Amino acid sequence: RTSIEQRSNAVSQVLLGIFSYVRWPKEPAVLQLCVVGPTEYADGLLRGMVQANGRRVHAERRAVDNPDLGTLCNVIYLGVVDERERQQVFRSLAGHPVLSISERGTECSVGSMFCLNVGGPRITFEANLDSIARSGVRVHPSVLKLARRQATP
Amino acid sequence: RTSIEQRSNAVSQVLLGIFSYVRWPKEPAVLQLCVVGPTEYADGLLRGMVQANGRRVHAERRAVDNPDLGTLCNVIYLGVVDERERQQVFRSLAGHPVLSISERGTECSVGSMFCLNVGGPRITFEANLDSIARSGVRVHPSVLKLAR
Questions:
Q1: DSSP symbol at B96
Q2: Which residues of A touch B (CB under 8 A)?
Q3: What CA–CA distance (Å, rounded) separates A94 from B61?
Q4: Residue ranges per domain, chain A?
Q5: Bridge partners of residue A149, in order along the sequence
Q6: Nearest CB neighbour to B79, from listed A1, A38, A60
Q7: Secondary structure E strands in chain A
Q8: I need a labelling partner for B107 at 20 to 30 A (CA). Which of A89, A143, B40, B41 fits?
Q9: Is A4 in Cβ contact with B63 (below 8 Å)?
């Protein structure tokens, strides 16, 4: 079984790997990532990140009921939230170009664009076409090369 | 800095405060703090702390299903865990002097020497007098005056 520090640094990459298939309508110089809700595997993230084009990914935690998640966040890494809390969040992102990703794989069905599954020998994820289309960012299809080859032994 | 960081740095401060009213059977040079489960406010802790008496608190995440929590852990800061996992956790803590604290002081009760309530303008916390005796650490009773 893979350790917490193993799975953290792993998530870090998968997110970078997802972020590669994503175009924002207006590309910021610093991409803004907001961690929202309790999380296990975001420690790696919050160090900050750099993309393969040198764009820094800046990372900070934000309150689930923060009403400006939408404008503060180009990315949101979503943790454990309850129905209401989840509602607040996905409402705040509407009309804004935001990439949403969950630590847990249940949430594709309720708002998140991507849903990690961190258990097992590899980090896997599934996606949802609905939330993706209404996201207002462009997601290249080949983002699924990554989940599939991750669901591979 | 955001309010989550603000509330995070404060959980730091509250944790230290509680630490001063606890003693362990055999005091370790370096206090082992296990953050366990999803945690909105444990980022200050993970950065590492130090007590006024100069002692270092080392903090690191450990998985919920981790069977050696009891030996690996001086203090455990319990995040989000379901009924099954909550049990799983406290069984490893059994018969070991482990200071148990929880981030959500509502859906918490079994174990959890202390349950924090981070919401509101300040951080508050209950104390679980039952859990406090069984645990195996010596908690000074003054601490209850810092409770609710």
A1: S
A2: 1, 3-5, 8, 37-40, 43, 46, 60-63, 79-80, 103
A3: 34
A4: 1-153
A5: none
A6: A38
A7: 22-23, 31-36, 49-50, 56-62, 75-78, 99-102, 114-117, 124-127, 138-139
A8: A89
A9: yes
